[PDB]
Amino acid sequence: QKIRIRLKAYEHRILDQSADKIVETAKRTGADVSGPIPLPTERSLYTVIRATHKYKDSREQFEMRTHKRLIDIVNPTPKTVDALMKLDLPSGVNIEIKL
């Protein structure tokens, strides 16, 4: 009800520690928070050849990995909105809230 937020980061340990912190602060003044729903964690690849002039027969690659979590909140209080705007850190994850 009128709030659901998203979590997107690179390291799942920072993800679920900040997710457990906000679940701890979730039903503080409110109630009925839904847990950390996982997401399929998009991934990219690249390709860089291991030389500077020749030698395409030997290569190298890397990866992007984007871990995504999800926490829903049902039937909230008004007091948690000003509480969650007092909740700002860590900085490795970026939240994505709606109403």
Partner: protein, 128 residues
């Protein structure tokens, strides 16, 4: 009434077997036996656990298969059924382990290597 469970997997294809005391058929994705399973002869293929346990019927089978190719998702039907026959009676697990049909095929498509044509095929290389 009660229903009998079971699941089977092969070749990036998953199946959810739902065994019921019936008459002996199979319904897959709310269709018939050989409307969604095409012209292939894979009946006694699937009925091979029945030839070692409760020959031949009479249990109708519900299953909802998805993913993979047709033969791989057909072969995964064998193992949910054999898991169900283990669920019914303990006295067939010897008859299954003599026949197999319980070990999941862990063998699937192999990772390539960046630098070849295929997973192990090398390109032509003229000596002279």
């Amino acid at each position: 009434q009660v229903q009998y469970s079971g699941t089977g997997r092969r070749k990036n294809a998953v199946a959810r077997v739902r065994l019921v005391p019936g008459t002996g058929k199979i319904t897959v994705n709310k269709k018939d036996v050989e409307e969604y399973i095409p012209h292939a002869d894979l009946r006694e293929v699937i009925n091979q656990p029945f030839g070692v346990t409760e020959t031949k019927g009479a249990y109708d089978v519900i299953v909802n298969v998805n993913g993979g190719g047709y033969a791989g998702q057909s072969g995964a039907i064998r193992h949910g059924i054999a898991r169900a026959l283990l669920q019914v009676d303990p006295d067939f697990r010897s008859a299954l382990k003599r026949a197999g049909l319980l070990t999941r095929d862990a063998r699937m498509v192999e990772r390539k290597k960046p630098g070849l044509k295929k997973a192990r095929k090398a390109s032509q290389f003229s000596k002279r």
